Amino acid sequence: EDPQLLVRVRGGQLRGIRLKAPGGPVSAFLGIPFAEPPVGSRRFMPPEPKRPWSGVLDATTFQNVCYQYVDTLYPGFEGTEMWNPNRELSEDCLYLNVWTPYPRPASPTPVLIWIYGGGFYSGAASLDVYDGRFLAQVEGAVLVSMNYRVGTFGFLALPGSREAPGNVGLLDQRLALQWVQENIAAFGGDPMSVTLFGESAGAASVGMHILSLPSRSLFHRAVLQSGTPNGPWATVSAGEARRRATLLARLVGCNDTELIACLRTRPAQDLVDHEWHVLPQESIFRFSFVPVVDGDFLSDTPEALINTGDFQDLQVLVGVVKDEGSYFLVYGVPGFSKDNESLISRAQFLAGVRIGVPQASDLAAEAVVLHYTDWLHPEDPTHLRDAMSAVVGDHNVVCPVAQLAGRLAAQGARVYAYIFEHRASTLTWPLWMGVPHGYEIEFIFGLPLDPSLNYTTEERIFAQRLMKYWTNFARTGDPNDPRDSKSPQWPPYTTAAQQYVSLNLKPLEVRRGLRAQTCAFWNRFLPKLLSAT
């Protein structure tokens, strides 16, 4: 019995496991209940705090993954399976994990809270790419990660109802955040320096905590990687959640109370089986059950909230990877695949646009096409393929990111922006996909430091740099290395200068304007074009 692996939290005692990191040991406290299991009559309901327990609770192993869809497009291919559930699926899934240095820190240590993505339909804090041991051992960080309910279980809403109020998967997150405030000092964490970080849906979730007042007393800084609360995919209107929830109910054979009661009688896979049948159009980068603009957790649309918000004493780090949209093309757009170069025709490019921008009228999709076509090389298959990925990435990530960055900067936040441009040497997806969505995470988490993983020594050095920016950001709100001099410095992003930096194997480079001309199309013109059909 190691005194270092025993912790008394408010609910009772816990026993961790000493793990081996390349540099030395870390303590991990995995599978901690932070809520009552949301099972039975608690399906679709806000989480309740976990009742205290007798004895010493075994926190040496990851808990179950929230009930979700398992990917089937490329069975047994690492590039897809690396995101698939790596534990048993259960609705009993509300647990969090804590890594700390060993011995546990002498003084209060900045806390990093990770919120996974997965389109609000998938994910788990147990995936190898979210391994907290490196950040804990190398940087001295206390690292936290929670499971939150995904899919229908997290986001099925009948707005204004008592029994499916919507946004419960975000309340799961808020609860883990509260758990950290109350409990993290016992692990050596500083609850007075908490930084949220997340990628994709995790980043939009982080963005919703910025925009929801009750969340604001539970963190100090935020990192949003490749996702935003604003934009076309991260929320739905109250009317449209109602539509999709009552559609799913028809599909499984089911007065709000009557309807919800019947949905609660349904086996979990029954919900998942029909989860994708409720989207209004054939689309990609669009998810059925997502946070709803309820007038509660979200008092207005994210767009409204970022336009009028006051972000006085907030610091934010945001960025994108080089090829945000490539990954999504293989899952819906005819002519695209990982098993070849995916060289498309003009006709397939026009069809792909109607799927990547499903909300577009004829005129608006034509404006997209006429903008993304290279008029010197209009029928060139390589250009057309790359433009298709660009449409998807710009519309869904880069331009929302640029819109958020600018509003936050203008409204008194401190913002730092990046583009991640290094393609993992170990990447299993083909070259044409470039640096796809999700593929910065392994570097930020420090995975190249594990020698058995086969990364180059250059990528190990680059990981160490990224871990430093991210933890310097957590410590100080400024990602710059206070010991390093000539770097060059990473400047804050502003609406005037519009400076962001390239994260790649070369030293930092400062660039201005994150797709400025193209994003003006998406953020300024396109709305005016749709709102007159």
Ligand X SMILES: *[C@@H]1O[C@H](CO[C@@H]2O[C@@H](C)[C@@H](O)[C@@H](O)[C@@H]2O)[C@@H](O)[C@H](O)[C@H]1NC(C)=O
Ligand Y SMILES: *[C@@H]1O[C@H](CO)[C@@H](O)[C@H](O)[C@H]1NC(C)=O
By beta-carbon proximity to ligand X, the closer residue of 64 and 342 is: 342
| Residue 335 near ligand X by CB under 6 A | yes
| Residue 511 near a second copy by CB under 8 A | no
Q: Interhelix angle for 362-372 vs 381-393, to 10°?
A: 120
| Residue 502 near ligand X by CB under 6 A | no
Q: What angle do CA 316, 321, 325 make, to 5 degrees?
A: 120
Stretch that binds ligand X, among 161-169, 301-309, 332-340, 487-495 (CB under 6 A): 332-340
Alpha carbon distance 69, 390 (integer Å): 27
> For the chain, how many helices (H) and strands (E)?
18, 16
By beta-carbon proximity to ligand Y, the closer residue of 319 and 448 is: 448
- Under rule CB under 6 A, which residues in 299-358 are in contact with ligand Y? 335, 337, 339-343
Q: What angle do CA 20, 22, 24 make, to 5 degrees?
A: 60
Rule CB under 8 A: choose which of 70, 262, 363, 461 binds a second copy.
Answer: 363
Alpha carbon distance 318, 419 (integer Å): 9
Amino acid at 40: G
| Residue 520 near a second copy by CB under 8 A | yes
φ, ψ of residue 340 to 5 degrees: the values are: -175, 180
Strands 17-21, 24-33: parallel, antiparallel or unpaired by DSSP? Answer: antiparallel
Amino acid at 300: D
Q: 276 contacts which partner out of ligand X, ligand OBI, ligand Y, none, CB within 5 to 8 A by kind? A: ligand OBI
Q: Smallest Cα–Cα separation from 89: which of 67, 70, 111, 115?
A: 67
Rule CB under 8 A: choose which of 376, 431, 483, 485 binds a second copy.
Answer: 376
User: Is 437 known to be catalytic?
Assistant: yes
Q: 454 contacts which partner out of ligand Y, ligand X, ligand OBI, none, CB within 5 to 8 A by kind? A: ligand Y
| Residue 339 near ligand X by CB under 6 A | yes
Q: 238 contacts which partner out of ligand X, ligand Y, a second copy, none, CB within 5 to 8 A by kind? A: none
Q: What angle do CA 233, 97, 114 make, to 5 degrees?
A: 35
Indicate which residue of 437, 440, 442, 459 is catalytic.
Answer: 437
Distances (CA, A) of 238 to 37, 259, 271, 288, 291: 27, 17, 20, 13, 10
Indicate which residue of 122, 126, 200, 389 is catalytic.
Answer: 200
Q: 379 contacts which partner out of a second copy, ligand OBI, ligand Y, none, CB within 5 to 8 A by kind? A: none
Question: What is the 3 state secondary structure string of 308-337?
Answer: HCCCCCCEEEEEEECECCHHHHCCCCCCCC
Stretch that binds a second copy, among 50-58, 99-107, 231-239, 365-373 (CB under 8 A): 365-373
Q: 520 contacts which partner out of ligand X, a second copy, ligand Y, none, CB within 5 to 8 A by kind? A: a second copy
Q: Least distance from C-beta 417 to ligand Y, angstroms?
A: 32
User: Is 324 known to be catalytic?
Assistant: yes
- Can you give the binding site for ligand Y, defined by CB under 6 A? 335, 337, 339-343, 453-454
- Can you give the binding site for ligand OBI, defined by CB under 6 A? 69, 71, 121, 272, 275-276, 327-328, 331, 437-438
